[model samples]
Structures are given as C-alpha cells and as structure tokens.
Target: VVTQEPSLTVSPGGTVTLTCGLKSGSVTSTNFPTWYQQTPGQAPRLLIYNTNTRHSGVPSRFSGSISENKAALTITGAQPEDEAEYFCALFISNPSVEFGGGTQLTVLSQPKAAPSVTLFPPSSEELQANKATLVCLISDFYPGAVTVAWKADSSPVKAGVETTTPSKQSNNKYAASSYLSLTPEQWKSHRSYSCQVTHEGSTVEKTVAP
Candidate 1:
C-alpha cells in the first residue's frame, strides 16, 4: 500500500486529502480494498470500502471517493484521536493472500472527523479491578476470508484467541468479530494485548493497555 504522508495537511476549516494507492498493479475483479484506523489502546475502526463507500456504522463525516476505480479515504474534520495511522488493504483472491503495509498520519489540526468505536465500561474503570472482555468487530469483510488473533506482549496468541466468519450482512459482503477475555488483575499487570486481523493479504493490529 502506498499512502501519501502527512496524508493531508489542512488548516482549521480547511480540507485534508488522503490518497491511497495499491502497489500491486492491475487489481482483478476478485480483489478489493479497505481503510481502517486504530486509536490508542483500542481496536481498529473501518473507514472506507472498495475504496469508496463508508463502512457500515462509520461516522457520516468520514467520507470516501474514487477516481477511475481507485479509492481515497478523507476525514473531513480531523481530531486529536484521528491523529493515528491509516491503513489501506487489498483483498487478494488466489492461493493465499496479502495486504499493503500501512501509513501513519500526523494530523496538524482537528476536523469534523469520522465515527469511532464506543468501548464499553466508559473509560473510568481500571483494567485491573474488573474482569473485562474486549470484542473486536468489523463489517463488510470478505466472507470466509478473514482471520483474527489475540497477542500478549507482541507474541503469538494461538492459545488465547479465536477467529470466526460472521453471518452475511448483504449481497456477498461478510463480517467478523473476536472476543478476548481477560481478568482485570491480569490486564492491569500486563504490558499490552493486541488483536490482529487479516483479510486477503493485509494485516492490522489494535493494542490495548493492560
């Protein structure tokens, strides 16, 4: 994935333009792309689709447009929370798949921004005092072609996480979500836990504070 950095540099009340291009030239009909954002100590959020439509439940302020079938993700009103990395994904179809590496965005100012995840527990509770479960979900995913995992301290989480394909949402599109359960005491003491998701070939991970 080739994402232009700064992504965009717009002043307050100005416009920001983000251009995402696939390095793997000549995408086939079996292939598609997506965009996502991962906030601090939280799961990644889906922003755009097929490089155009905003994924279901995404904020209306976050918009996507295309030129000659090429997609672009644009956050109209940027915010402090939007100042994180952005990812572009390619869904390869044949024998095993792959994704483009992501690009980090450094927002200079706040904008209208997109809809974000609303994690339960309201942010006031300590991770150590409560038994918690973090659920990561994504819509418009390629059916039967998604993977999910949980990792602690950056290591493989084969024993702790599981991934499953979700029921159909519409047409041929699919969705998926994973549940990672942990004791409040464990989360407070651990350094970090991450949920890594993959489709086609690209991979994105969301790390939460323990």
Candidate 2:
C-alpha cells in the first residue's frame, strides 16, 4: 500500500500541524524535510527547508520544525499573502515519492472570503441528456477525511462515482479527489445540490443551484 501523508486545514493566521510516518513505521532523523507553496498560476516555491529554516525570501509566516518523529509546518500570524497550497517532504531521492503531510490554506480576514467549496467545469449550465461530471474541490480543512455526495432534488443521489487520493507531490501532505457522473435530467431536476465537507468530525456545507 502507498504511504499516505497527514492532512491539515486552517484559516489565515491560524495554526496548522502536520504528522508524517513511514510505510514500514520507521522515520529517520537524516531525512531532509521540505515544504513548498503553489499559487493558482505561479510556480511552486520552497517555503521551509531542513524542517524549520525559512528558505531565502520566504515570508516568516511559513515556518517548519520537527517534534518527536514527525515534521511540522506552522504559519504564524497568517495573512492574505499566505493563502495557498502547501506540502511537506522528507528523503529527497527516489525510491518512491513519499510525503509527510498536505495542506491548503486560505486567508479569510477580509477581501474575498476563502471559498469553502469550489466546482470544476466552472459553469453550472448543462446540456439536455448529456453525460457530465462534477468535481467538487474543498480545501482549508482541519483533519482530512472529507465526504462527497450528489443530491437530486430531496433525495440522496446514487450514481457512478469514483474517489482516490492523488499522490503526495510535496513534503508533508497528500491530496484527495473524487469524480461524480450524472445525466442532464439529474442535474436540472434537482432543486438544490450540496457538497458537504467534513473534517475533525465537524461539518460545513456549500450549496449550489440554491
């Protein structure tokens, strides 16, 4: 089985914690832990290195360190400048790509409120009888384990759906994604559709076509 990294989500200027482990259950101190940030259109940049040292030109808000056996990345006094996706890594070479944790953050002090839910395919419009897919992207979470379901009208939707965790592309975290397919009738007939995101056993929901 693939080694999965821990996940975290928090508001701007909030505290975030990450935990990493080995598939075989042994992590070494020699491992070089690193963290990176990727904005919507810009290239991914290194934020933290060797566990806690801030990379050159990196803001002080992004900081990392090791506690016990797991490496942690924390953003103190978070601001809008820190809103982005981040991940942690250890052991740079290739035996297989393994990450320690994953996180996506939003600075919600003002401006546009960080979106709790976002949908791919951008538009809500659909063609009659056409087969379509909806991808719900939920980020800025505490804990991981999010649930995705499609609702048709007042009923729970039952359709062909697939879910998977995309590999950890960075140091510290893994990515999770899901795919849902439905027909036009199911899309248009539904008066309300919702994507409920849950983390830490608590829930926050976003509704579309409301």
Candidate 3:
C-alpha cells in the first residue's frame, strides 16, 4: 500500500516538505516516483516525475528526492497558491502503478493566534436570588478550532455546561462562548468559575467569582 501525510501547513515564503511511502518496503528511485498537485475544482497538475525531474513549466522551487526511505517533495519559498492536495505515484513493478493518499496543504497568511478567554460572573442580584449563569467568552482565535472545558472552584464541572460552535468574525478570526447554568441553591453559594480554552497548542483560562 502507498502512504502519505494527511495534511501539511506552510507560511508564504517558507518551505514545506511532504512524503510518500510504500508500506511494503523502502521507496527506491527505480519506482519512478511521480508527484501531482491538485487544487479544488481543478485537475491534478504534474510536478515531478522519475523521482527528481520537473515537468514542463514546473518551477525550480519544487524538488523531489528520496529521504527517510520515502519519496519526498519539497517546496521552497512557498506561496499561497501552493495550497492544494499533493499526491505521489509509484511504478512498483513491471506493469503496475500506485498512487498514495494525498496530503492537503494549508498555506497560512499569518501564524496561529491564541484566543482571548474572558470569564464573566453572573449579576450580583441574580446570584443573590439563587438564579444565575456564568459566561466564558472566547474571541479572536486564528485557524478556527478550539477545545474548551469548565470548572467550578477548580474542579471539573460537566453538567449544565454548554459551548457554542465557533463563528467566523469579520477579521477572519473566530468567536465562541460557553455558559454554565447553576442550580438555584448552587448559585447562592460563593464559588469560583473557570473557563479554559485551548487553542491550537496554547491554553488560556479565565475565572470569575460570586
């Protein structure tokens, strides 16, 4: 079976490397490795063939080589338009051809930005009246997804917690929210609430108290 990276990422003017492999054994030059680049709604374009040869009109920035026992495709000084699916094909035997699962490339305009975590306490009146909801506001995160959790006085609070789907903002950032619904008597008690948001590789948390 042929194998490849599921996804890859790069910033403009930077470099990114993707690899394809033959799970049966090491990929050799004799495999006549071929690479293709494909964007949405378009046919695949040939980039490299016979391991290291570029096709007509293919730029020098794109190179193919053997590394780590696999077929490698390296793109130097990458561009936004380079964002696409990349596939590697191999001629394994006298009369056989195999294509690897493609790698989806993401070209980012900017580095990932962590979201701001803001925990808002319930109204004093509402807390005193034993009816309250605490809010965790997530804002301005880049590249979209995030992980969230709620805590009560630093202890995991699973029940009555609701988190919203991330919504795109005007600046191409994302916004999300989580609410913790407290029981009547539970709200009356003085306790701290924590909202922890993990964005990409960073974790930020905010807290509010009754």
Candidate 4:
C-alpha cells in the first residue's frame, strides 16, 4: 500500500527529499512511518522513527516529516557517504507493517575527470603465434562508471573483445582495462586501432598506428 521513487540522485552537499505515498489512505503521525538507510554490504539502520524522531547515533542531517498527505524523508548537506538504499515502513496495526518500494540514493561526487587511456599493441612474439592482443587501460575517474569500445580502422569491432568492471582505487577513483584479440594478419591489415572511452558525459578516442 506504500510507494516511492525507485532511485534518487544528488550531488555532494546537496539535499534529497524522498516521499512515501499511501495508495488507499493518508499518512499521519499516528501511522508512525519510519525511515531506514542501508549501504552496500551493510545492514539497514534506522534513521527516523515515529515520523520525526532521529534514531540514536543518526546525524541531524536526516529528518522525517508529514508533508501534505505523504511521509517525507529529507537528507540535508548530503555527502558521498550518504549513498545508500532507503526504505519507509508504516505501522498501521498491532501486527501489520507495510513498507514502501525502496529508493536508491546516489550521492554523486564532484564531476568525474576524463580518464587516462593507454593502448598497448601486441609484441613480435605474439605475431609469430598469429595472435595479437590490444590492451586498453583506463584510470583516474570518479563515480566509477566508464565505457570502453574498440575500433579497427574506424569501424566498430565486437568479436574477441573483453572489458573489465571498473575497479575502485585508493583515491576513490576507478580503473578498468579492456582487451581485444585478433589474428596477427588482421592486426597488420588494419591501418589503425582505436580505444574509445566515455566518461563524465564526454568521449575520448585514442588511436595507434601499427
């Protein structure tokens, strides 16, 4: 009987206000809507209970209230550490507790910088075996999502390609690598090989000539 947005995104130091809706009725202080926060790999923690009371150890930045006809959870001065999943539960009866669809809060950091990209061509020993591998290394990006694509002589290539999931680095950035394999003959036939990386809403293409 409760519903909420599936996802909410906000920048660091921003504010996020999520609302919990009741399908057949209204929310009030008597309903005792409670809000909970859960981070990846961690157990859910109570944020607000009885509508507005912050649970023990919860910071003052998080608050709950009844706005108009719904229950509202407001997070002020959000930080990257605030990224988590949030759920709201309503206690309507002695034995019944109804929960809203959870909302995923993504507290985005500063705008991610363009990643450093490198392409390593196959070696002579690889050519002797008629196999070549192209390596694309991407590093130094924030927010942890990047796309890598391969091209041969300006045409897209899909076969024999493998891309890694972005790995977290010590500085809170990310690193990823992609590989493309082909016959040495095909590598030699192509005039150029390209690795295109998309990050932070922009694309960078790096190409190397054989």
**Which prediction has more favorable TM-score, 3 or 4?**
3
How do the predictions measure up, each by TM-score?
0.42, 0.51, 0.56, 0.54
Candidate 4 C-alpha lDDT tens digits along 1-210: 898876676888999899998998899898999999998789999899999999999999998999988999999999888998899999878897899978777688666556988888988889898789998999997656676789999899999999996778888788999999988888898899899988755788889777
Give the candidate number with the greatest lDDT.
4
RMSD of 2: 9.4
Runs in model 3 lying further than 4 Å from the true structure: 111-210
Model 1 worst lDDT window (10 residues)? 113-122
* Model 1 stretches with alpha carbons more than 4 Å out: 1-8, 24-30, 95-97, 109-210
What does the lDDT come to for candidate 3?
0.85
The better-scoring model by lDDT among 2 and 3 is 3
Tens digit per residue, CA lDDT, model 1, 22-131:
56554433355677887546777887776567877887767766544445667777655665557666675566435444544544432322212222221335444465
lDDT of 2 by residue, 74-115 (tens): 677766676666766778457844564456554554222122
User: Which is the winner by TM-score between candidate 2 and candidate 3?
Assistant: 3
| Alpha-carbon RMSD, each predicted model | 14.3, 9.4, 9.0, 9.2
Worst 10 residues of 4 by lDDT: 105-114
